[PDB]
Design an enzyme around this catalytic site. Structure first.
Site, PDB file in Angstrom:
ATOM      1  N   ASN A  72     -73.227-105.312 -84.340  1.00 56.20           N
ATOM      2  CA  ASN A  72     -73.443-106.355 -85.314  1.00 56.20           C
ATOM      3  C   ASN A  72     -74.907-106.299 -85.761  1.00 56.20           C
ATOM      4  OD1 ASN A  72     -73.601-108.826 -86.714  1.00 56.20           O
ATOM      5  ND2 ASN A  72     -72.833-110.088 -85.039  1.00 56.20           N
TER       6      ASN A  72
ATOM      7  N   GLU B  51     -67.587-108.641 -71.997  1.00 56.62           N
ATOM      8  CA  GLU B  51     -68.006-107.333 -72.529  1.00 56.62           C
ATOM      9  C   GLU B  51     -68.455-106.415 -71.408  1.00 56.62           C
ATOM     10  OE1 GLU B  51     -70.714-108.312 -75.951  1.00 56.62           O
ATOM     11  OE2 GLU B  51     -69.836-106.548 -76.933  1.00 56.62           O
TER      12      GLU B  51
ATOM     13  N   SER C 145     -67.998-109.222 -80.369  1.00 58.27           N
ATOM     14  CA  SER C 145     -69.265-109.108 -81.063  1.00 58.27           C
ATOM     15  C   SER C 145     -68.981-108.619 -82.501  1.00 58.27           C
ATOM     16  CB  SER C 145     -70.118-108.076 -80.325  1.00 58.27           C
ATOM     17  OG  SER C 145     -71.341-107.869 -81.012  1.00 58.27           O
ATOM     18  N   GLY C 146     -69.553-109.319 -83.490  1.00 55.23           N
ATOM     19  CA  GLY C 146     -69.338-109.008 -84.902  1.00 55.23           C
ATOM     20  C   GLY C 146     -68.031-109.551 -85.489  1.00 55.23           C
TER      21      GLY C 146
ATOM     22  N   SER D 204     -76.525-109.663 -84.584  1.00 50.87           N
ATOM     23  CA  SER D 204     -76.005-110.095 -83.284  1.00 50.87           C
ATOM     24  C   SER D 204     -76.751-111.291 -82.699  1.00 50.87           C
ATOM     25  CB  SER D 204     -76.094-108.937 -82.285  1.00 50.87           C
ATOM     26  OG  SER D 204     -75.551-109.283 -81.014  1.00 50.87           O
ATOM     27  N   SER D 205     -76.020-112.296 -82.173  1.00 54.85           N
ATOM     28  CA  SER D 205     -76.647-113.413 -81.463  1.00 54.85           C
ATOM     29  C   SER D 205     -77.007-112.921 -80.063  1.00 54.85           C
ATOM     30  CB  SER D 205     -75.654-114.581 -81.310  1.00 54.85           C
ATOM     31  OG  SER D 205     -75.161-114.958 -82.585  1.00 54.85           O
TER      32      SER D 205
ATOM     33  N   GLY E 202     -68.343-113.419 -75.460  1.00 52.76           N
ATOM     34  CA  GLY E 202     -67.273-113.370 -74.468  1.00 52.76           C
ATOM     35  C   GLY E 202     -67.421-112.186 -73.551  1.00 52.76           C
TER      36      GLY E 202
ATOM     37  N   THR F  28     -70.619-116.663 -85.346  1.00 56.00           N
ATOM     38  CA  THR F  28     -71.827-117.331 -85.873  1.00 56.00           C
ATOM     39  C   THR F  28     -71.627-117.768 -87.328  1.00 56.00           C
ATOM     40  OG1 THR F  28     -73.239-116.271 -84.271  1.00 56.00           O
ATOM     41  CG2 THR F  28     -74.299-116.827 -86.375  1.00 56.00           C
TER      42      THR F  28
HETATM   43  N1  LIG Z   1     -66.265-115.220 -93.404  1.00 52.92           N
HETATM   44  C1  LIG Z   1     -67.256-114.341 -93.604  1.00 52.92           C
HETATM   45  N2  LIG Z   1     -67.652-114.089 -94.877  1.00 52.92           N
HETATM   46  C2  LIG Z   1     -68.542-113.108 -95.095  1.00 52.92           C
HETATM   47  N3  LIG Z   1     -69.110-112.280 -94.207  1.00 52.92           N
HETATM   48  C3  LIG Z   1     -68.725-112.579 -92.950  1.00 52.92           C
HETATM   49  C4  LIG Z   1     -67.843-113.579 -92.570  1.00 52.92           C
HETATM   50  N4  LIG Z   1     -67.717-113.623 -91.189  1.00 52.92           N
HETATM   51  C5  LIG Z   1     -68.500-112.655 -90.774  1.00 52.92           C
HETATM   52  N5  LIG Z   1     -69.123-111.967 -91.785  1.00 52.92           N
HETATM   53  C6  LIG Z   1     -69.952-110.763 -91.676  1.00 52.92           C
HETATM   54  O1  LIG Z   1     -69.839-110.239 -90.358  1.00 52.92           O
HETATM   55  C7  LIG Z   1     -71.137-110.212 -89.733  1.00 52.92           C
HETATM   56  C8  LIG Z   1     -70.971-110.481 -88.255  1.00 52.92           C
HETATM   57  O2  LIG Z   1     -70.521-111.852 -88.109  1.00 52.92           O
HETATM   58  P1  LIG Z   1     -71.076-112.798 -86.974  1.00 52.92           P
HETATM   59  O3  LIG Z   1     -70.694-114.194 -87.276  1.00 52.92           O
HETATM   60  O4  LIG Z   1     -72.597-112.660 -86.818  1.00 52.92           O
HETATM   61  O5  LIG Z   1     -70.405-112.251 -85.635  1.00 52.92           O
HETATM   62  P2  LIG Z   1     -70.498-112.744 -84.115  1.00 52.92           P
HETATM   63  O6  LIG Z   1     -71.326-113.978 -84.118  1.00 52.92           O
HETATM   64  O7  LIG Z   1     -69.056-113.028 -83.677  1.00 52.92           O
HETATM   65  O8  LIG Z   1     -71.091-111.648 -83.316  1.00 52.92           O
HETATM   66  C9  LIG Z   1     -71.947-111.240 -90.514  1.00 52.92           C
HETATM   67  O9  LIG Z   1     -73.353-111.055 -90.352  1.00 52.92           O
HETATM   68  C10 LIG Z   1     -71.443-111.012 -91.943  1.00 52.92           C
HETATM   69  O10 LIG Z   1     -72.014-109.862 -92.576  1.00 52.92           O
HETATM   70 MG   LIG Z   2     -73.158-114.498 -83.274  1.00 54.79          MG
END
Ligand SMILES: Nc1ncnc2c1ncn2[C@@H]1O[C@H](COP(=O)(O)OP(=O)(O)O)[C@@H](O)[C@H]1O
Ligand SMILES: [Mg+2]
Length: 755
Positions: free
Chosen positions: A191, A442, A149-150, A194-195, A440, A154
């Site tokens: 996050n 958790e 997560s984070g 968070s999704s 994944g 996404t």
């Molecule tokens: N390549 C990137 N460039 C800039 N910020 C990013 C990038 N990847 C992630 N982030 C930051 O990290 C945060 C969490 O990423 P996210 O994709 O939502 O995580 P996940 O979907 O794996 O839980 C985003 O909202 C953003 O602030």
């Molecule tokens: Mg996500």
């Protein structure tokens, strides 16, 4: 001479071996002459000779192991190079800030049609390789974006979609994201964005490999979030985007106010994501007392006011009319007002309830917004039909209200996802590229049905990863006589069957409980333990090594021994959480709404959440098994959402738990690119003079490769196919290119060489 040895917080540290003992090595940390520490022999690794260099593909390292992989990605991360390959797999370390220009239109154009490795590692190169494989092999493709997560799943999923649509289109697929995130993402401890649902996004292509449309599949929206949150978390973004950004006209029509005024928001964080500029755009009447005291929430991506504006623009761009926009907002506000309906005890033995006099306005606003009669709504929340209309206790009325709220909101999310699919439809398509973005494995101090479903999903997806990366790959190498050292795995069908087998699986036993006259979480739990007493993947909560599980009774939970780690699930609410359908009396109240939009959301009442998800997951797995697969492993560098803070031990743990460490030798010693001698000979044949045509296909391939200056460091001949090693994608792509001028030229080169 220098080696990598364990370090508690950095994962590994540089040192020199100064002594050896039984099952130990004595390490002298670099430049600390006299100081020593002990390390197990198997925890000490060779280091690269040049400590300052970095390689774009980890397979290029002289000594590829968990320590040199960690160091290489660390050096790259310090220089804002967040992307690194392991052959054709991509590692992406979350930067937690916007790195200038790396996602620009100019950068997108630079990746188009380039072989892997020709350009620096990037999510765009994985997307382009999937497109090229789709077009050449005439086979649909899946890109799986994994991690904690984070970690960035996404964000990387959005970069892949933007790259493919901007490169190979003729914007709605990209524009659909703010809408889905508004209704399905929320601030969590791990996050801010968070999704709270999983998704598989498909981009569909015609026979000319041009974009024709898309399709989004959604999984397991978190219903618990709708009614209550932890103090540092929030409900779905939409509620705050609406409160922060709605015009005063909308605020008045929906009877909105600051988030602290709503039970469904006020146990969570009531503050907005804003900066100095956007804070001035949010009106004073939208700000909670805690926002006025502590100030705004900070994030580099999220902004509640800005995001509301961007969502309205996305809605316009996708073709969502102003009428549909207000219809969505009315349901959102109706759910908020529903949450404000409070109950008080009634009856000489507190057997019944009444609406609190202070809840009169909430009842009125809720009924108005959901198109219901105030009396029918009050009656449905305070009584039960069994004919016979009996009072509900306060706790039961709270449950009925919350069940209605969760069902209305989940049906609204289903509507939004379907509406997005209707904005980029296609009558037909030749292939697709699908991107998988799902949480994944958790576990937390308390694990419920939501974790149970996600961990079940992970068992099935882990099995797919094992079958594709290890089983299928190595069966090909063995059949071809390549002599690649074998990486073994233990299959987890016993864990999958425990959860999903027909009749005996946990999901079926749970469904059995929902269908009983008086369903009970305890009766369900005892039935699981009794049916699976001989199952080595299941145990009672008392068998746990942790003190937090000492008080959990046998009928109050169960432990699943996932290979990722043992998880103790508390079964309270499993029966309620397993039902996607509303009680008949609440269903009829809502189906009979005066509002067409409300009736259209809903166009013994029991729908199994577990089995609905099993069917969806099986359809997803059917797609993954029938397509080519590419993998992106997202890494979270720290637990503080900060940039330039690489926590080596935390990253090492992710590299180990992801299975990346276990496959390093297999990927480095593997052959990701291959073609049969027959397909190559048949492609060149018509351009060949007799001297070349007379050669057996395998011999022609040998002459072609030698003429072009290729050797054993580039390829290996199998029984029927030629195999190219990691870092040789450009060379392989040259050999495979079917353009007549290109083929004629290579034949000219071979003819000249042969003389
Ligand atoms: N390549 C990137 N460039 C800039 N910020 C990013 C990038 N990847 C992630 N982030 C930051 O990290 C945060 C969490 O990423 P996210 O994709 O939502 O995580 P996940 O979907 O794996 O839980 C985003 O909202 C953003 O602030
Ligand atoms: Mg996500």
């Amino acid at each position: 001479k220098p080696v990598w040895a364990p370090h508690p917080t950095d994962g590994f540290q540089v040192g020199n071996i100064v002594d050896i003992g039984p099952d130990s090595l004595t390490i002298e940390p670099l430049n600390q002459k006299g100081k020593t520490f002990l390390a197990l022999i198997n925890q000490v690794f060779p280091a690269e000779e040049d400590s300052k260099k970095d390689v774009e593909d980890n397979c290029s390292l002289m000594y590829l192991n968990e320590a040199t992989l960690l160091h290489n990605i660390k050096v790259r991360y310090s220089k804002d190079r967040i992307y690194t390959y392991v052959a054709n797999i991509l590692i992406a370390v979350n930067p937690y800030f916007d790195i200038p220009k790396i996602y620009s239109s100019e950068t997108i154009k630079s990746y188009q049609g380039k072989s892997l490795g020709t350009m620096p590692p990037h999510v765009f190169a994985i997307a382009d390789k999937a497109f090229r494989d789709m077009k050449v092999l005439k086979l649909s493709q899946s890109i799986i974006v994994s991690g904690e997560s984070g970690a960035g799943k996404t964000e990387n999923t959005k970069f892949v979609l933007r790259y493919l649509t901007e490169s190979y289109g003729t914007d709605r697929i990209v524009e659909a994201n703010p809408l889905l995130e508004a209704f399905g993402n929320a601030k969590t401890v791990r996050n801010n964005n968070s999704s709270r649902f999983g998704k598989f996004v498909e981009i569909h292509f015609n026979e000319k490999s041009s974009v024709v449309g898309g399709f989004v599949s959604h999984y397991l929206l978190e219903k618990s979030r709708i009614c209550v949150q932890g103090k540092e978390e929030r409900n779905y973004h939409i509620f705050y985007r609406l409160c922060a950004g709605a015009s005063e006209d909308i605020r008045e029509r929906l009877h909105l106010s600051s988030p602290d005024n709503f039970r469904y928001l006020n146990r969570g964080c009531t503050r907005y994501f804003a900066n100095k500029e956007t804070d001035k755009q949010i009106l004073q009447n939208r700000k909670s007392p805690e926002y006025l005291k502590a100030g705004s929430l900070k994030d580099p991506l999220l902004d509640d006011h800005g995001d509301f504006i961007r969502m309205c623009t996305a809605m316009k761009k996708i073709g969502l009319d102003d009428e549909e926009k207000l219809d969505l907002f009315r349901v959102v506000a109706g759910v908020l007002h529903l949450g404000n309906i409070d109950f008080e005890e009634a009856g000489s033995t507190s057997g019944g309830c009444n609406l609190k006099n202070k809840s009169t306005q909430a009842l009125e606003y809720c009924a108005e917004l959901l198109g219901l009669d105030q009396d029918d709504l009050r009656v449905s929340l305070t009584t039960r039909v069994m004919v016979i209309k009996v009072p509900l206790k306060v706790e039961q009325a709270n449950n009925a209200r919350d069940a209605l709220a969760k069902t209305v909101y989940s049906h609204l999310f289903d509507h939004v996802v379907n509406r997005v699919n209707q904005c980029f439809p296609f009558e037909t398509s030749s292939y697709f590229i699908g991107v998988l973005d799902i949480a994944g494995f958790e576990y937390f101090e308390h694990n419920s049905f939501e974790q149970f479903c996600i961990n079940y999903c992970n068992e099935k997806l882990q099995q797919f990863f094992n079958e594709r990366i290890l089983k299928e790959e190595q069966e090909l190498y063995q059949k071809e006589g390549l002599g690649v050292n074998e990486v073994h795995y233990v299959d987890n069908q016993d864990c999958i069957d425990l959860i999903e087998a027909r009749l005996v699986g946990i999901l079926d036993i749970l469904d059995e409980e929902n269908r009983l006259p008086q369903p009970s979480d305890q009766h369900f739990t005892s039935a699981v333990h009794q049916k699976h007493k001989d199952h080595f993947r299941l145990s009672i909560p008392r068998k746990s090594k942790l003190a937090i599980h000492r008080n959990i009774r046998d009928d109050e939970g169960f432990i699943i021994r996932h290979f990722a780690g043992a998880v103790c699930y508390e079964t309270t609410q499993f029966v309620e959480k397993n039902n996607d359908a509303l009680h008949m009396s609440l269903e009829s109240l809502i189906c009979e709404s005066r509002d067409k939009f409300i009736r259209e959301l809903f166009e013994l009442s029991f729908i199994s959440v577990g089995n609905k998800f099993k069917t969806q997951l099986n359809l997803l797995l059917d797609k993954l098994r029938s397509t080519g697969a590419s993998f992106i492993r997202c890494i979270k560098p720290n637990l503080k959402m900060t940039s330039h803070h690489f926590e080596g031990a935390q990253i090492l743990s992710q590299l180990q738990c992801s299975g990346m460490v276990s496959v390093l030798d297999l990927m480095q010693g593997g052959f990701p690119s291959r073609a049969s001698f027959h397909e190559l000979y048949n492609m060149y044949k018509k351009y060949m003079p007799d001297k070349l045509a007379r050669l057996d296909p395998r011999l022609f391939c040998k002459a072609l490769f030698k003429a072009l200056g290729l050797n054993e460091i580039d390829y290996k001949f199998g029984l029927t196919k030629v195999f190219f090693r990691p870092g040789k994608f450009a060379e392989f792509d040259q050999i495979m290119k079917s353009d007549p001028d290109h083929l004629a030229e290579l034949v000219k080169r071979v003819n000249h060489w042969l003389i």
